[PDB]
């Protein structure tokens, strides 16, 4: 018995050990009662405002499409306090763990940026932080694991199974079933079991409702698409909550696809994998012909997840958002487009969804139409995985 | 076939508990695997409980964890694991088999699929440890089936509405869930109102597990009315011990289940 549907068509539900059953109920009873009270939206709001920034600027981009017809927006997460989107739902997260009474925070983090925006929730609201983080993932993420220790969060490396996001993941849950009645397990995308998925997008969707306002307000009408680059769903899932019913607008995703979907080292499970039972959750993902789950791979770790969230698989399904992919090279070009014509660093993640946006002007220069990328994220922490590629191919 | 019925009408004939070891299928290899669950049947194992190795075993601590990397390492595959449980049936008409699995294995090529071909070898029982009640539904309608016990976990907070699906729904034996967290010998109550309501609701007899790793808590578990107890990470610890030494292994493995399964009577 819950009090929301769990799935998306298909796709959901909630797949753990029976002792982590009575963990999700509360949590999606606190979300739910937290839905219904203006005391705790007005917190939020004022958390959002006041300390993260928000609203986040839509900025014009006119350089990079001169001589067509597309007109293109950023949608500015970039601008957000800690440099990407997710800070938007650790702090809704951090709000419902105290109205949980728990004083203890547990995060998993792979490219370690949710791992970032965890430590700087808990530490301003005064919870206690543990982030399990792959071994591997602990040595090439070495200044997000210094952020983490900065802001006072306890980093701890995780050596099994494959030593990265999805062994962190294990841990997390592992952790959480001895411990939920005083940790709050603050997961960090729009997947794994219900009630996350949902309430990960509930509190990204003000992404989506400020993207709405400002473009009617700048244009006059609706976007003709929202483009988001997806890897575990909660940025484009943000940005596209308040259009689905807008039947208007287009909804693209953008998977990675590394070095190409035919080379079988990418990041696209939704178009591209199987679906499976894991992560909590029944949803496509990168697996073994036996089942065994795979690894998937990006020039952004941020991307690098071999699973999508369950709305995402769903919306795809029934046609209303389309899901495509882009390769490392493609996410470069449209890095260095974006610092050497707009002066903005796009995080490498984000840069997925511009490549794309960029082949749709490209692909059609007279083709009128009005596009909102999401940008996710700054990419200062990418300038040197982007050095290092283009000093290697001799750039 | 009803292998836990017919066990459970010996055992309670004789006054005594089940002793259930749990190893994983092919650790550290499929030949000394197999050797090592002739040993826990020649040495008193009233059931089996096996692991398929998967590469993300959530609900399992340090010691099963790398109970499945040792069979990885051997190249051990869903697909093998199926040959072996076929040949140990072959070998032991009557013992209760029962597996743990992950769903995304039995959910891969099919839920129907899967259990078929646990009735195929041999299978009595299926534990999936990622499937609670609420997500059951084509898991225990396919075991069923197929002549399949679908195994569920009773965890120690189960409220009444837990336990009448639990009763309800499962079959073979009911897994009595000693505490929260996950397996593992190095953290160790079976409370009478579980083990008496599950009775009252007419369950499948209880099996306690998690930490079992000593003589006198199968005792233990008998005396509070639990039809037996299953031990794990404390047989698979031996496996780790001993690897460089697989004869020394089947030996002290001997003795462990020998000392488990004289404290059920
Ligand atoms: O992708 C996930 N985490 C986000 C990590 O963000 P980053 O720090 O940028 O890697 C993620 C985490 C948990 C999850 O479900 C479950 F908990 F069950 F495993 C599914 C996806
Ligand atoms: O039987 C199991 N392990 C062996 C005995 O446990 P231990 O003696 O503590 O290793 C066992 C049973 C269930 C399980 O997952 C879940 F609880 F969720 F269903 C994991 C392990
Ligand atoms: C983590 C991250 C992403 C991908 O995560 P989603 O949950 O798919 O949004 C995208 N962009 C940035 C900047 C990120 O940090
Ligand atoms: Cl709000
Ligand atoms: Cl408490
Ligand atoms: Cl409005
Ligand atoms: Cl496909
Ligand atoms: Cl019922
Ligand atoms: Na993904
Ligand atoms: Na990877």
């Given at each position: ?14 797949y753990?050990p029976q002792?982590?059953?009575?963990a ?5 009873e606190?979300?739910?009662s ?14 959002l ?8 600027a839509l900025?014009?981009?006119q350089?990079i499409?001169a001589?067509?017809?597309?007109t293109?927006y ?9 440099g990407?989107?997710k800070?938007n739902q650790?702090?809704?997260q ?6 949980m009474?728990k ?5 998993e983090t ?7 925006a ?13 982030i399990y ?6 040595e090439?993420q070495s200044?997000?694991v210094?952020?983490?220790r900065?802001?006072?969060?306890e980093?701890?490396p995780?050596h099994?199974?494959?030593?990265t ?11 959480w079933?001895?411990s939920?009645?005083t ?26 409702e400020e993207?709405?306002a ?5 244009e006059g009408?609706?976007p003709?698409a929202?483009?988001a ?5 909660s940025?484009?899932?943000?940005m596209?909550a308040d259009?689905i ?8 995703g953008?998977?990675p ?26 949803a496509p993902?990168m ?7 795979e ?8 991307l690098?997840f071999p ?6 698989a ?10 495509v992919?882009?390769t490392d090279?493609?996410?470069l ?9 707009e002066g903005?660093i796009?995080?490498?993640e ?7 946006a960029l ?11 009005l ?11 990418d300038?040197?995985?982007?050095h290092d590629?283009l000093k290697a191919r001799?750039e | ?9 010996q055992?309670?004939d004789?006054?005594?508990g089940?002793?259930?070891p749990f ?14 669950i ?10 089996l ?6 590469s993300?075993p959530?609900?399992d601590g340090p010691?099963i964890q790398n109970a499945n990397?040792?069979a ?23 013992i ?9 294995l039995?959910?891969n090529?099919?839920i129907d ?5 646990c ?10 440890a990622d499937?609670p009640?609420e997500?059951?539904?084509?898991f ?5 089936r197929?002549?399949?016990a679908?195994?569920?976990?009773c965890?120690p907070?189960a409220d ?6 639990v009763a309800s ?5 009911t897994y ?10 190095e ?5 009478h ?5 599950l009775?009252?609701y007419?369950?499948?007899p209880?099996?306690q597990?998690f ?23 404390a047989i698979v610890?031996?496996?780790e011990?001993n ?7 089947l030996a ?13 009577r």
């Amino acid at each position: 018995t819950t009090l929301l549907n769990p799935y998306f068509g298909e796709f959901g539900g909630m797949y753990v050990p029976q002792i982590l059953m009575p963990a999700l109920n509360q949590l999606e009873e606190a979300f739910v009662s937290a839905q219904k009270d203006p005391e705790f939206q007005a917190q939020f709001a004022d958390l959002l405002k006041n300390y993260a920034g928000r609203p986040t600027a839509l900025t014009k981009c006119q350089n990079i499409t001169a001589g067509t017809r597309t007109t293109l927006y950023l949608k500015r997460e970039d601008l957000l306090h800690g440099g990407a989107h997710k800070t938007n739902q650790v702090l809704g997260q951090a709000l419902l763990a105290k109205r949980m009474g728990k004083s203890e925070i547990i995060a998993e983090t792979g490219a370690g940026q949710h791992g970032v925006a965890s430590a700087l929730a808990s530490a301003l609201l005064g919870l206690k932080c543990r982030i399990y983080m792959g071994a591997k993932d602990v040595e090439r993420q070495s200044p997000n694991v210094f952020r983490m220790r900065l802001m006072g969060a306890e980093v701890i490396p995780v050596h099994s199974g494959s030593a990265t996001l999805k062994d962190a993941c294990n841990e997390a849950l592992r952790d959480w079933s001895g411990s939920y009645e005083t940790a709050h397990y603050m997961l960090g995308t729009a997947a794994g079991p219900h009630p996350y998925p949902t309430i990960v997008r509930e509190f990204q969707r003000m992404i989506g409702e400020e993207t709405k306002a400002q473009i009617l307000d700048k244009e006059g009408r609706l976007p003709d698409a929202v483009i988001a680059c997806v890897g575990g769903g909660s940025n484009a899932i943000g940005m596209f909550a308040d259009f689905i019913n807008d039947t208007s607008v287009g909804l693209i995703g953008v998977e990675p696809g590394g070095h190409g979907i035919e080379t079988g080292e990418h990041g696209a499970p939704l178009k591209h994998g199987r679906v499976g039972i894991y992560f909590g959750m029944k949803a496509p993902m990168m697996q073994t012909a036996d089942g065994q789950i795979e690894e998937s791979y990006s020039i952004s770790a941020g991307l690098d997840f071999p699973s999508v969230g369950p709305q995402h698989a769903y919306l795809n399904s029934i046609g209303r958002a389309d899901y495509v992919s882009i390769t490392d090279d493609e996410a470069l070009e449209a890095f260095k487009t974006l610092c050497r014509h707009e002066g903005i660093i796009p995080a490498l993640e984000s840069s997925h969804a511009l490549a794309h946006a960029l082949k749709m002007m490209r692909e059609q220069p007279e083709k009128e139409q009005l596009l909102v990328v999401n940008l996710s994220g700054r990419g200062d922490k990418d300038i040197f995985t982007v050095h290092d590629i283009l000093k290697a191919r001799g750039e | 076939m009803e292998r836990y019925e017919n066990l459970f009408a010996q055992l309670n004939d004789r006054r005594e508990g089940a002793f259930v070891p749990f190893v994983t299928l092919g650790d550290p290899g499929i030949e000394q695997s197999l050797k090592i669950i002739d040993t826990l049947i020649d040495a008193g194992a009233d059931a089996l409980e096996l692991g398929v190795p998967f590469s993300d075993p959530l609900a399992d601590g340090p010691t099963i964890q790398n109970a499945n990397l040792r069979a990885f390492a051997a190249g051990v595959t869903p697909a093998q694991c199926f040959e072996m449980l076929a040949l140990i049936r072959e070998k032991h008409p009557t013992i209760p088999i029962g597996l743990l699995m992950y769903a995304n294995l039995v959910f891969n090529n099919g839920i129907d699929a899967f259990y078929a071909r646990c009735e195929q070898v041999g299978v009595d029982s299926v534990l999936v440890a990622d499937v609670p009640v609420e997500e059951s539904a084509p898991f225990r309608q396919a075991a069923l089936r197929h002549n399949i016990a679908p195994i569920f976990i009773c965890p120690p907070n189960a409220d009444d509405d837990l336990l009448r699906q639990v009763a309800s729904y499962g079959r073979g034996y009911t897994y009595l869930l000693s505490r929260s967290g996950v397996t593992g010998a190095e953290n160790r109550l079976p409370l009478h109102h579980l083990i008496e309501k599950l009775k009252e609701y007419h369950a499948a007899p209880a099996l306690q597990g998690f930490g079992i790793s000593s003589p006198e808590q199968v005792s233990a578990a008998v005396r509070a009315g639990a039809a037996g107890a299953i031990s794990g990470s404390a047989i698979v610890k031996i496996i780790e011990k001993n690897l460089a030494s697989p004869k020394q292994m089947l030996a002290e493995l001997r003795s462990f289940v020998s000392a488990m399964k004289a404290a059920s009577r």
